[PDB]
Coordinates of N, CA and C and ligand atoms in Angstrom, one line a residue:
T1 N 34.3 112.3 8.9 CA 34.2 113.0 10.1 C 35.3 113.9 11.2
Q2 N 35.1 115.1 11.8 CA 36.8 115.1 12.4 C 36.5 114.7 13.6
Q3 N 36.4 113.6 14.6 CA 36.2 113.6 15.4 C 37.1 113.0 16.1
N4 N 37.7 112.5 17.4 CA 39.1 112.5 18.1 C 38.4 110.2 17.9
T5 N 39.8 109.9 17.9 CA 39.4 108.2 18.3 C 40.6 108.0 18.8
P6 N 40.4 108.2 20.2 CA 40.8 107.4 21.5 C 42.2 106.3 21.3
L7 N 43.2 106.1 21.2 CA 43.7 104.8 20.9 C 44.1 104.6 22.4
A8 N 44.4 103.2 22.2 CA 44.6 102.6 23.0 C 46.1 102.0 24.1
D9 N 46.2 102.6 24.5 CA 47.8 102.3 25.5 C 49.1 101.6 25.0
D10 N 48.9 100.9 24.9 CA 49.4 99.4 23.6 C 50.0 100.9 23.0
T11 N 48.7 101.7 21.8 CA 49.4 101.4 20.7 C 50.6 102.0 20.6
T12 N 51.7 101.5 19.3 CA 52.9 101.9 19.2 C 53.3 102.1 17.5
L13 N 52.7 103.5 17.4 CA 52.7 103.4 15.7 C 54.0 103.2 14.9
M14 N 55.1 103.1 14.1 CA 56.2 103.1 14.2 C 56.1 103.0 12.3
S15 N 56.6 104.0 11.8 CA 56.7 104.0 9.9 C 58.5 104.1 9.8
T16 N 59.4 104.3 8.7 CA 60.1 104.9 8.3 C 60.0 105.1 7.2
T17 N 60.8 106.3 6.7 CA 60.8 107.5 5.4 C 62.4 107.6 5.3
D18 N 62.6 107.9 4.1 CA 63.3 107.9 3.5 C 64.8 109.3 3.4
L19 N 65.4 110.2 3.0 CA 66.0 111.3 3.1 C 64.8 112.1 2.7
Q20 N 64.2 112.4 2.1 CA 63.3 113.4 1.6 C 61.1 113.2 2.5
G21 N 61.4 111.9 3.0 CA 60.6 112.0 3.6 C 59.4 110.9 3.1
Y22 N 59.9 110.5 2.1 CA 58.6 109.6 1.5 C 58.7 108.4 2.7
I23 N 57.7 107.4 2.6 CA 57.5 106.7 4.0 C 57.5 105.6 3.2
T24 N 59.1 103.8 3.1 CA 59.8 102.8 3.0 C 58.7 101.8 3.5
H25 N 58.0 102.0 4.9 CA 57.7 101.0 5.2 C 57.1 101.8 6.7
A26 N 55.4 100.5 7.2 CA 54.9 100.9 8.6 C 54.7 100.0 9.1
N27 N 54.5 100.0 10.3 CA 54.5 99.0 11.1 C 52.3 98.6 10.8
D28 N 52.3 97.3 11.8 CA 50.7 96.9 11.3 C 49.6 98.1 12.1
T29 N 49.8 98.1 13.1 CA 48.9 99.4 13.7 C 49.1 101.1 13.2
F30 N 49.9 101.6 12.8 CA 50.1 102.4 11.7 C 48.6 102.2 10.4
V31 N 49.4 100.8 10.0 CA 48.6 100.8 9.0 C 46.1 100.7 9.1
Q32 N 46.2 100.3 10.5 CA 45.2 100.2 11.5 C 44.2 102.0 12.3
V33 N 46.1 102.1 12.2 CA 44.6 103.6 13.3 C 45.3 104.4 11.5
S34 N 45.8 104.7 10.8 CA 45.2 105.8 10.0 C 44.6 105.5 8.6
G35 N 44.0 104.8 8.5 CA 43.3 103.8 8.0 C 43.5 103.3 6.9
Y36 N 45.2 103.6 5.9 CA 46.0 103.5 5.2 C 46.6 102.3 5.3
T37 N 46.9 101.3 3.9 CA 47.2 100.0 3.7 C 49.0 99.9 3.5
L38 N 49.6 99.2 3.8 CA 51.4 99.1 3.2 C 51.6 99.6 2.3
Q39 N 51.0 99.3 0.8 CA 51.4 99.5 -0.7 C 50.9 100.6 -0.2
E40 N 49.9 101.7 0.1 CA 49.3 102.8 -0.4 C 50.0 103.5 0.1
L41 N 51.0 103.9 1.0 CA 51.8 104.7 2.2 C 53.3 104.2 1.6
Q42 N 54.0 103.1 0.6 CA 55.3 103.1 0.5 C 55.0 103.3 -0.5
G43 N 56.1 104.7 -1.0 CA 56.4 105.5 -1.7 C 56.1 107.1 -1.9
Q44 N 55.0 107.1 -0.8 CA 54.3 108.6 -0.3 C 55.0 109.0 1.1
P45 N 54.2 110.5 0.6 CA 55.5 111.5 2.0 C 54.7 111.0 2.9
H46 N 54.9 111.8 4.5 CA 54.4 111.2 5.2 C 53.9 112.6 5.9
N47 N 53.0 113.9 4.5 CA 52.6 114.1 5.3 C 50.3 114.2 5.2
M48 N 50.2 113.0 4.4 CA 49.1 112.2 4.1 C 48.0 111.6 5.3
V49 N 49.4 111.8 6.2 CA 49.0 111.3 7.7 C 48.6 113.4 8.2
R50 N 49.1 113.8 8.0 CA 48.9 115.3 8.3 C 47.6 115.8 8.6
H51 N 47.4 116.3 10.1 CA 46.1 116.7 10.4 C 46.0 118.9 9.7
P52 N 45.1 119.2 8.6 CA 45.1 120.5 8.5 C 45.8 121.4 8.7
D53 N 45.4 120.6 10.8 CA 45.6 122.0 11.9 C 46.6 122.0 12.5
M54 N 47.9 121.2 11.7 CA 49.3 121.3 12.3 C 50.1 122.5 12.0
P55 N 51.1 123.6 12.9 CA 51.3 125.0 12.1 C 52.5 123.7 10.9
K56 N 52.9 124.8 10.0 CA 54.0 124.8 9.6 C 55.2 124.3 10.3
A57 N 55.2 125.6 11.4 CA 56.7 125.6 12.2 C 57.5 124.3 13.3
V58 N 55.6 123.4 13.3 CA 56.3 121.6 14.0 C 57.4 121.3 13.1
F59 N 57.2 121.3 11.5 CA 57.7 120.7 10.8 C 58.9 121.5 10.3
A60 N 58.6 122.1 10.3 CA 60.0 123.2 9.4 C 61.2 122.5 10.7
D61 N 61.2 122.7 12.2 CA 61.8 122.8 13.4 C 62.2 121.5 13.5
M62 N 61.6 120.2 12.9 CA 61.7 119.1 13.0 C 62.8 118.7 11.8
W63 N 62.6 118.9 11.2 CA 63.4 118.5 9.8 C 65.1 119.6 10.1
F64 N 65.2 120.6 10.7 CA 65.8 121.5 11.1 C 66.7 121.1 12.2
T65 N 66.8 120.1 13.3 CA 66.9 119.2 14.1 C 67.2 118.1 13.4
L66 N 66.7 117.4 12.0 CA 66.9 116.0 11.6 C 68.2 116.5 10.7
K67 N 68.4 117.5 10.0 CA 69.8 117.4 9.4 C 70.5 118.2 10.1
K68 N 70.5 118.4 11.3 CA 71.6 117.8 11.9 C 72.1 116.8 12.7
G69 N 71.4 116.1 12.5 CA 71.8 114.4 13.0 C 71.1 114.9 14.1
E70 N 70.2 115.1 14.5 CA 69.8 115.1 16.2 C 68.9 115.0 16.3
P71 N 68.0 113.8 17.4 CA 66.3 113.2 17.3 C 65.5 114.4 17.8
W72 N 64.2 114.7 17.2 CA 62.8 115.3 17.4 C 62.2 114.5 18.2
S73 N 61.2 115.2 19.2 CA 60.4 114.7 19.4 C 59.2 115.9 19.4
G74 N 57.6 115.3 20.0 CA 56.8 116.9 19.8 C 55.4 116.4 19.5
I75 N 54.5 116.9 19.5 CA 52.9 116.4 20.1 C 52.6 117.0 18.6
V76 N 51.6 115.5 17.5 CA 51.9 116.0 16.6 C 49.8 115.1 16.3
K77 N 49.4 116.0 15.9 CA 48.2 116.1 15.1 C 47.9 115.2 13.5
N78 N 47.5 114.3 13.8 CA 47.5 113.4 12.4 C 46.2 113.2 12.3
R79 N 45.5 112.9 11.0 CA 44.8 112.9 10.3 C 44.2 111.9 10.1
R80 N 43.6 111.2 9.6 CA 42.8 108.9 9.1 C 42.4 109.2 8.1
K81 N 41.5 108.1 7.1 CA 41.8 108.4 6.2 C 40.1 108.5 5.7
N82 N 39.3 108.9 7.2 CA 38.0 109.3 6.5 C 38.2 110.3 7.6
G83 N 39.7 110.9 7.8 CA 39.8 112.4 8.8 C 39.5 112.2 9.9
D84 N 39.4 111.0 10.9 CA 39.0 111.3 12.6 C 40.5 111.8 12.4
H85 N 40.8 112.9 13.4 CA 41.8 112.9 14.0 C 42.5 111.9 15.4
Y86 N 43.9 112.0 15.3 CA 44.4 111.8 16.8 C 45.4 112.0 16.5
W87 N 46.4 112.3 18.7 CA 46.6 112.9 18.6 C 47.8 112.0 18.9
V88 N 49.4 112.3 18.4 CA 50.4 111.4 19.2 C 51.6 112.0 18.9
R89 N 53.0 111.6 20.2 CA 54.4 112.0 20.5 C 55.0 111.3 19.5
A90 N 55.6 112.2 18.6 CA 57.1 111.0 17.7 C 57.6 111.1 17.9
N91 N 58.5 110.9 18.1 CA 59.5 110.2 18.5 C 60.6 110.0 16.8
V92 N 60.7 111.1 16.0 CA 62.0 110.7 14.8 C 62.8 110.9 15.6
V93 N 64.3 109.6 14.6 CA 65.2 109.4 15.0 C 65.8 109.7 13.6
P94 N 67.2 109.8 13.4 CA 68.0 109.8 12.1 C 68.8 108.3 12.0
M95 N 68.5 107.6 11.1 CA 68.9 106.6 11.4 C 70.5 106.3 10.5
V96 N 71.2 106.2 11.1 CA 72.7 106.4 10.2 C 72.8 104.9 9.6
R97 N 73.7 104.8 8.3 CA 74.4 103.5 7.9 C 75.5 104.0 6.9
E98 N 76.7 103.2 7.7 CA 78.6 103.4 6.9 C 78.6 105.3 7.1
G99 N 78.0 105.4 8.5 CA 78.3 106.8 8.7 C 77.5 107.6 8.5
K100 N 76.8 107.2 7.5 CA 76.1 108.4 6.8 C 74.6 108.2 6.7
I101 N 74.1 109.7 7.1 CA 72.0 109.1 7.7 C 71.3 108.4 6.3
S102 N 71.0 108.0 6.6 CA 70.4 107.0 5.2 C 69.1 107.4 6.1
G103 N 68.5 107.8 6.2 CA 66.5 107.8 6.4 C 67.5 108.3 8.1
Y104 N 65.0 108.0 8.6 CA 64.8 107.8 9.7 C 63.8 107.3 10.0
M105 N 63.6 107.0 11.3 CA 62.5 106.3 11.8 C 62.0 106.6 12.9
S106 N 60.7 106.6 13.4 CA 59.8 107.3 14.0 C 58.8 106.4 14.4
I107 N 59.3 106.3 16.6 CA 58.1 105.3 17.1 C 56.8 106.4 17.4
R108 N 55.9 106.4 17.3 CA 54.6 107.3 17.3 C 53.6 106.4 18.9
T109 N 53.8 107.2 20.1 CA 52.3 106.6 20.9 C 51.7 107.7 21.0
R110 N 50.7 107.5 21.7 CA 49.6 108.1 22.3 C 49.7 108.8 22.8
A111 N 49.6 110.3 22.1 CA 49.4 112.0 23.2 C 48.5 112.0 24.5
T112 N 49.1 112.0 25.8 CA 48.6 112.4 26.6 C 47.9 113.6 26.7
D113 N 46.4 113.4 26.8 CA 45.5 114.8 25.9 C 46.2 116.7 27.1
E114 N 46.9 115.6 28.1 CA 47.7 117.0 28.9 C 48.3 117.6 28.2
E115 N 50.0 116.5 27.4 CA 51.0 117.3 26.6 C 49.8 118.1 25.0
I116 N 48.7 117.7 24.6 CA 47.3 119.2 23.7 C 47.5 119.7 24.2
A117 N 46.8 120.0 25.3 CA 46.4 121.3 25.6 C 47.7 122.0 26.4
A118 N 48.7 121.7 26.5 CA 49.6 122.7 26.0 C 50.2 123.3 24.9
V119 N 49.9 122.5 23.8 CA 50.8 123.3 22.2 C 49.8 123.7 21.8
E120 N 48.2 123.9 22.1 CA 47.1 123.5 21.4 C 46.9 125.4 21.2
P121 N 47.0 126.4 22.4 CA 48.0 127.5 22.1 C 48.7 128.2 21.4
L122 N 49.8 127.1 22.2 CA 50.8 127.4 21.3 C 51.2 127.0 19.4
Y123 N 50.4 126.2 19.2 CA 50.1 125.8 18.2 C 49.3 126.8 17.1
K124 N 47.9 127.1 18.1 CA 47.1 128.4 17.2 C 48.4 129.7 17.6
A125 N 49.2 130.3 18.1 CA 50.2 130.7 18.4 C 51.9 131.0 16.8
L126 N 51.5 129.5 16.5 CA 52.1 128.9 15.1 C 52.3 129.4 14.0
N127 N 51.4 128.5 13.4 CA 51.1 128.3 12.1 C 50.7 130.6 11.4
Ligands
FAD201 C1 60.2 110.2 10.0 C2 59.0 110.8 9.8 C3 57.8 110.7 10.2 C4 56.8 110.9 10.2 N1 55.6 111.4 10.4 C5 55.2 112.4 10.7 C6 53.0 112.4 11.5 O1 53.1 111.1 11.7 N2 52.6 113.5 10.5 C7 52.6 114.4 10.5 O2 52.0 115.2 9.8 N3 53.7 114.5 9.2 C8 54.7 113.5 9.6 N4 56.1 113.4 8.8 C9 56.6 115.3 8.4 C10 56.2 114.7 7.3 O3 56.8 114.4 6.5 C11 56.1 115.8 6.5 O4 57.1 117.2 6.3 C12 54.9 117.5 7.1 O5 53.2 116.6 7.5 C13 55.1 118.3 6.5 O6 55.0 118.3 5.7 P1 53.9 119.6 4.6 O7 53.9 119.7 3.3 O8 51.9 118.8 4.6 O9 54.5 121.0 5.6 P2 54.9 122.0 5.2 O10 54.5 123.3 4.5 O11 55.9 121.3 4.3 O12 55.7 121.5 6.5 C14 56.3 123.7 6.7 C15 57.9 123.4 6.8 O13 58.3 121.8 7.0 C16 59.2 121.9 6.5 N5 59.8 121.2 5.7 C17 59.0 120.1 5.4 N6 59.4 118.6 4.9 C18 60.9 119.2 4.2 C19 62.0 118.7 4.0 N7 61.7 117.3 3.5 N8 63.2 118.7 4.1 C20 63.7 120.1 4.7 N9 62.6 121.2 5.4 C21 60.8 120.4 4.9 C22 60.2 123.6 5.5 O14 60.9 123.9 6.3 C23 58.3 124.2 5.5 O15 58.4 125.0 5.3 C24 57.6 112.6 9.4 C25 58.5 113.5 9.5 C26 59.0 111.5 9.0 C27 60.7 111.9 8.2

């Protein structure tokens, strides 16, 4: 199925990746919503969650901003294990340890559907 899974108001997905984007930890809500357990996520890139409809230009601008040491945010469409889609607004922030960017943490809330209708014409003009 490709249908939408409506998320609750308190939905707060949080995860941590290394400098190459491979997941190092994931909170319990990310495990429940994504359908993947913690051990299946650890040591895996964050693209197993990526929905194929998401443009390449969205992630290219994120890593350009992240590699500059700056935080990034945007409306993201994700994919579950069964394959249902759910929109979020990712808030990826570079993690700094001893003056060095050690990784990136992100807190993903539920996307208001009005942010979806504003990027869908832009997303089909991006990829
Ligand atoms: C903390 C964190 C949380 C994330 N959460 C999500 C999430 O919830 N959903 C989601 O879909 N993605 C998420 N991502 C992005 C994920 O890691 C992938 O980069 C994304 O899915 C795109 O990878 P891809 O190979 O599928 O597409 P690609 O074809 O690789 O993406 C297009 C462009 O992305 C750029 N890019 C991707 N990875 C890198 C990299 N490591 N270094 C430099 N440039 C790069 C390249 O310029 C490339 O041309 C997250 C990343 C981080 C760091």
